[PDB]
Amino acid sequence: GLIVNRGMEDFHRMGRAVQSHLGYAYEDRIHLNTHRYDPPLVPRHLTRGVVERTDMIGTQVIPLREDTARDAARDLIAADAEGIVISLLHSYKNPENERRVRDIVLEEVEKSGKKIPVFASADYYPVRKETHRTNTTILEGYAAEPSRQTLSKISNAFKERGTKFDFRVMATHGGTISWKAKELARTIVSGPIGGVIGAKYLGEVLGYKNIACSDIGGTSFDVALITQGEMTIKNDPDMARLVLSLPLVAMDSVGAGAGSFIRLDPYTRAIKLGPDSAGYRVGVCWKESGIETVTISDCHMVLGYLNPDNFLGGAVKLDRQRSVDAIKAQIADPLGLSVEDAAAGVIELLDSDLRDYLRSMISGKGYSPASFVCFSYGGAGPVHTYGYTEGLGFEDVIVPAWAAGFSAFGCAAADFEYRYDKSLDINMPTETPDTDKEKAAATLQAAWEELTKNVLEEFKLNGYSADQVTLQPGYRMQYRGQLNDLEIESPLAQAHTAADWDQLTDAFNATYGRVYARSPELGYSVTGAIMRGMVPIPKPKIPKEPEEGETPPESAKIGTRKFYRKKRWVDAQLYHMESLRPGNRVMGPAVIESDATTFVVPDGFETWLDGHRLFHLREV
Amino acid sequence: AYTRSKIVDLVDGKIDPDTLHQMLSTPKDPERFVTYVEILQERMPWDDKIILPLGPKLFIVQQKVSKKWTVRCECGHDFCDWKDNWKLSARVHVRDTPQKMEEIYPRLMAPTPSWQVIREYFCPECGTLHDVEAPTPWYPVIHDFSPDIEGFYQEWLGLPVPERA
Amino acid sequence: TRGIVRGGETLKEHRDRLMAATKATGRYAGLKTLELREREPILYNKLFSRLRAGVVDARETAKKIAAEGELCFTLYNAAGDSLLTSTGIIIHVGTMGAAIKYMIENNWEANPGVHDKDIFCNNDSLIGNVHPCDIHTIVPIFWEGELIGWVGGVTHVIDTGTGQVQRFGYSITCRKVGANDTLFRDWLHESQRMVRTTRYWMLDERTRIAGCHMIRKLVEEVVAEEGIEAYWKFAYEAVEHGRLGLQARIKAMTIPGTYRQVGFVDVPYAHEDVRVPSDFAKLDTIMHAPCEMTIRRDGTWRLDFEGSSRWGWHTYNAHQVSFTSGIWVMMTQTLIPSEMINDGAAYGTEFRLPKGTWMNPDDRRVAFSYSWHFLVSAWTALWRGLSRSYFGRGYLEEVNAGNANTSNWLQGGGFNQYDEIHAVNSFECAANGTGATAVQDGLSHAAAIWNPEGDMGDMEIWELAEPLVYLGRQIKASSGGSGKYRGGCGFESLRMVWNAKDWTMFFMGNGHISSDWGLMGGYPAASGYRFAAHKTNLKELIASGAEIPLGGDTDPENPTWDAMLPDAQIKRDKQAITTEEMFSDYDLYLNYMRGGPGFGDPLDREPQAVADDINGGYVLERFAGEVYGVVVRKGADGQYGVDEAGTAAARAQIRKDRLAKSVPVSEWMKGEREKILAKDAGTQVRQMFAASFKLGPRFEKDFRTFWSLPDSWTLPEEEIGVPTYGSRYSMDISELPDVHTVQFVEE
Amino acid sequence: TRGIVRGGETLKEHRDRLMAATKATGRYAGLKTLELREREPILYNKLFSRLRAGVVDARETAKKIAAEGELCFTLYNAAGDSLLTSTGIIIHVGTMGAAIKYMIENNWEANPGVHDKDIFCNNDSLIGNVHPCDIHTIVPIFWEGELIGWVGGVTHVIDTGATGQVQRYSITCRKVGANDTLFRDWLHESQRMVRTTRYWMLDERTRIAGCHMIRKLVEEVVAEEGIEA
Ligand SMILES: Nc1ncnc2c1ncn2[C@@H]1O[C@H](COP(=O)(O)O)[C@@H](O)[C@H]1O
Ligand SMILES: [Mn+2]
Ligand SMILES: [Mn+2]
Ligand SMILES: [Zn+2]
């Protein structure tokens, strides 16, 4: 159920209008008739309203009329609501009214004798934007407990086969939490944000502050930047076609993976990739899969990048001839090209799309690739690493030997970290009396304390006491008028004095200049307080082998295959990836194969393997 | 192409969202028209060949005997020659007063009859509402569509033009 | 080379050649073959992909300067023709394209000259622009000393400079505002006086120049890697490519023939609450936008607006550039939803806008500050026309009855809760109802015609910008057009003035007339009305615990708020357009967004959809039986359910009532003809026809023929009894010497 | 000498000096004595009588470019202070002088730069002007690459635009020409502010013609009687 302000019962089901076209590709976004509303999380007949209004600064324009809160509660109870969510406007600023309604609801629930949980948005996600907040708070009263059952089973399936531990789950903010945490809406993340946490994890170990991550999968092309050791967070994302209030590790989708379909527009004859992908079914090279439209994977077959007999270690029987036939009919003949030049052409377009997106993405942060290192992972990453890194000037291009599971490796490398956020609106001229700076610190400090309670309560239910939890206070600050994408780790555990405030402003000017053209004159704003709490846990150990000769063992050679590139067929030396030793060099043309990965190294390229089993791709 | 049963559900508004999104976002199937008219033909109480639908229950038909093309309602009423405007041979009800307007709109939300009028054009036989105009007073009756059936069948669909008298 | 274009042609010699080849062959630049595209398919596809991707990156990277709107960027070839446009609203592709074509035809090359690293700015009224506040930044692209194209960037400034009626109430004519990538100081000081707030204008200029220079570098890098030989072909093949794309889409989705439709909207300037200073401007008028759409076998098509009404003393007129350039934001939502959209589509479409009409006034006094009011009311009819082609061909998924009037534009002025100038309005009319489909209902509160990515905004964000508080936000019951499938419903919000000083507000939207029509049996969306309450005494009502207005105006025929405010001055009428009016704290303002038209016979709608609509607040119970013929019964759970047997009898009874109350069209016609002969109609109707006749002879002939009127019958506008200033004496643009405007339209 | 004013001072440095001397001494430019007037009276009376006559000549001569009285021309020193004014209504001596002092205070010298043969135009409301339709043309006078004064020409244009106005066409010292040639974008843009083109175009040709006549006058006087004097 849902209780909101009287007269605004509809704002949830209206989805702010935007939810009728979230997750659409460009052509669908403008194609009006494609727009569609999903059913509301809470239906109208389970939504009620209380008479009350609190303005933007907490002023109570319309005092709460408590009898309207009792009747609202009684109605949802009579309708047998399995959960009651409360979300009043500006409750993040002054939760007095929303928490009073909460207490009223709890009272009326007691009188009924029914077990009905109550969720006040100011207690779960006290942040701006009522549609983002209410959606996120509803997920707790709608999908939390059912998902605990779901993951209780997953964790049980492993327990009854050997495991002696409690599973952790990934959360939007990059940290991992318990599957029975108080707030599980943060586990709605499904994308490969682990890849960003993994790269950042390796960066700390190898001294790589600036990393450009590229996760090339079978269903998605995902990219992200780690700049000066820190990654970008999106604070008002949209997921499941819902606007939400969850801090999310920022990644940009660039395509639909190696399974992306290749078509020719019927009106334009333009080569079109995706937006849909064959995903698991690889492509038309898999007869038993029923795919009838060629994919990027089929192009890899024609060009000879992939091994037909060694797809997933030979579990998938692929027939290259089907790729040659389907590309001839669908792409090559319509364009007047050979099957090779067509497949090669597609790969050429894809490489330039990824190349441009990385270059612009780095350029948008104020850097050049020369300051950055590129991590190319994912099953298909190593297949294109040469292509979309050519001539960008990356300080170093790296392909982890465990690229196929780098995203899963990152979920293990993440911290056992809970995070809680709250909105603020501190406005501070550059020059104010210490009185005003003390009040500013008091506002931010009071937020840090309310958040610390939430963080530590999450850990206590997990068996950890406060003395075991490491608290990292944070906040979102900016120059008045200038939005930014920075989050500041507070240098102080708490703040009270006007000198502690100056220490927080300086902490921002330091991080800002460290990542980037400052403007400290306009003053400072604090739009949100952050609290993070971490507990030590076992993290995946990085290999650290001693490097040997630079000639790979002859046992690592596993035949030759011909692949087509630059209008030329070339005989490539095949290698067994895990047979290669640290120190070994591999001259192009070559194809270093694993059971779930293929690292291509055309002529004009070279790669060497280091003690950490990381491949370094160079342009000789 | 799309299965016939899938196109039937499109005609009935029972189509599912996934396929409806596919139809909108993927290349149009050229065989749509032939399948479309064949479905409609199978649900008419008469066997006169449809050559172009003009509305949910309004078509340009080929009279079986005379081979003359006429506009016809689903119930079977012929309005006129396919070149003429069927509305000129129909029945109309004009809402030119606040009383009439307030039967279909709430007051204040209703158009003001001295500025805009509602013209409801019906079939004289079954009373089906085939089209509603909302012009000003005095405004002529609108001839909505004059299709070039010959060029349509011949040049675009690659079909023979039906016989005509 | 003498001229500055690559090859040695002047900008005008170059364009004149391409335009001559376009006329003689019917193909842009006389490109009977696209050698690059045919001979080098990959390089051609890569050129679009990189240029499109780089143009979007410029738009999004430059956008990141906020505290998206009309923001957009377009890449043009040397002749001023669009190749690629960024994400965003593309209504300014032609306005900026016209600005380039104005410099070409007025020998800017010679004076003030077009040099590398120059910066031009423009918003000219006579060149063509949607809004006066839509500022263009245009930068020329040079390669090895020769010009190869242009870049255009546009923004909608929100704080520039009551009851305008004549144009002489700002104008920038392709002014050189900078050189060597450096802006001139006299321009910076001058343009900051054209504005009430400085922050918005200044950042917007940075953004436009940023995106432009990014795109300029983007081209210099593409041309460097792929060569100028390749790019030079692409800069003209891509346009002829767009034309072929539109032609192929027409032949594939539509039907050849002639489609005839018309649209209307009211301009009630006689009401006392429209405080215009010119007394000759105070009269009721109606917009008349007839359209004869001709789709041809060769895949070309023609939009002829013969018979339209004259321009009027108000701000709802348009420009032929504004009309044709902006019509594609609608077309790309149904016929050509493509990221390749460029001027090629324009060269595949014929527009006839008769000179002197509201869409092609050719008079320098004309104002156009709020063109949307007419534009959205005229374009909707084209949805219905195209839908007839989709419906007959069988592509019912594409059918759409039309777009709602993008109306009630909440506008306010004064000092906000921060004791500062008001600049940001709510803009909830971005989420109106949409037209019904031949397959399903329309989307409620979902989109506007000039932006299908409708976003309603969060209430908590608007209350940080406006000195207003939400007392309600609710779906507008019975606002969607009735039909077998219901048109999308609008929505409404009740605002209370809170911590405002020197505050004023006015209403803006259709009132007496519904601009959209239903399709093939469907009805039009609800029309607009106004609600505002002053001297409410709400502070004392809130404190005392008395009844207070909340939610939306559910049934304005039976309102509940008015009685709660006995001491209030309540304005509740159909005056959907007003001039600035004084408001103060605790006053009320109803923001009502319109719904979309419906589709099909209402009593063919499935009864459960009617019951679901009542329970959902989309239809007032009253009309369940009168409009749809569905008998509903309230149950224990309070939900309405269908009465199967009772519905069947009601539907069968309505059908007999229809045949009874109806009349043969032949009979009704002779009665309407008597009224026409007696000239029996309001002045607004007669003025509309009288003015439409003079500007549209072909329309007057059809009118006279249809009604069998004798030549003795005449409808001179001068004998209606209303002001007629501007009907016989004009201020043509031809009076201006040394000014060469370009004709994109037949007239 | 970097500053464009004679001696090397910038426009602002120059005026700032003279204004500080005025505030301190109670005498304009700190002139406790008038050496030229007292030691060379004939030459002093000759410069005034001749400049006054040449300015009047420019006003009456330019007047024959239409057919007013609000037409007027003024000669300023480098600091924007009036020396002489033609026949006509003298309301605009201060308004135009204020336009000159605006360019001085807002660093027009660096951007868009004040060069010889440059043409400026002004009617700004915030700088201060009698009517919105009273248009100013300001030309700088140079001698041997250094600025020694300004010329201002004004006309009341009868056919501009803009009703029952209640709250507030603004030209803020815009450089509308260089090399004594007007910019096309300025000419086109100006023909949209006016109802009829004739009056606006002749008035500008009048203002410029008079400004250039006065510029030639100064150059001729300076040449014959010396720049020192
Ligand atoms: N030996 C391989 N076996 C299976 N998939 C591979 C192999 N090499 C590359 N792939 C690519 O990696 C993709 C899967 O990556 P991912 O989605 O990260 O699991 C496939 O769709 C292929 O494009
Ligand atoms: Mn605009
Ligand atoms: Mn004057
Ligand atoms: Zn019938």
Residue numbers in the entry:
A (entry chain E): 95 to 610, 614 to 717
B (entry chain F): 2 to 166
C (entry chain D): 14 to 80, 87 to 180, 189 to 196, 199 to 776
D (entry chain A): 14 to 80, 87 to 181, 189 to 194, 199 to 259
How does the study describe this entry?
ACs contain metal ions but not organic cofactors, and use ATP to activate substrates through phosphorylation. The first structural rationale for acetone carboxylation is presented here, focusing on the 360 kDa (αβγ)2 heterohexameric AC from Xanthobacter autotrophicus in the ligand-free, AMP-bound, and acetate coordinated states. Like many carboxylases, AC is a heteromultimeric enzyme complex. Its architecture consists of two heterotrimeric αβγ subunits joined by the interacting α-subunits to form a dimeric core.
The AMP-bound structure exhibits dramatic rearrangements of the β-subunits relative to the ligand-free state, with a Cα RMSD difference of 6.3 Å, while the α- and γ-subunits remain almost the same with Cα RMSD of 1.3 Å and 0.3 Å, respectively. First, in the AMP-bound enzyme, the displacement (11–18 Å) of several amino acid residues that participate in nucleotide interactions leads to closing of the substrate-access channel. Most notably, β-Phe405 is displaced by 16 Å, to a new position where it interacts with the adenine of AMP through π-stacking, capping off the access channel. β-Ser391 and the helix of which it is a part rotate into hydrogen bonding distance with the ribosyl moiety. Second, a new internal channel opens up in the AMP-bound structure, connecting the nucleotide-binding site and the Mn site where acetone carboxylation occurs. After nucleotide binding, conformational changes within the β subunit result in loss of an interaction between the side chains of β-Asn578 and α-Glu85 and formation of a new one between β-Asn578 and the carbonyl of β-Met571. The Mn-proximal α-helix concurrently forms a disordered loop (α-81–87), allowing the opening of the substrate channel and the bidentate coordination of the α-Glu89 carboxylate to Mn. The Mn in this structure appears to be coordinately saturated, with α-His150 and α-His175 as monodentate ligands and two side chains each bound in a bidentate mode (α-Asp153, α-Glu89). The structure of AC in the presence of bound AMP and in the absence of these phosphorylated intermediates may therefore represent a trapped state, bound to the product AMP but lacking intermediates needed to proceed further in the reaction. This trapped state reveals the internal channel that is proposed to protect the semistable phosphorylated intermediates from the bulk solvent as they travel from the nucleotide-binding site to the Mn site.
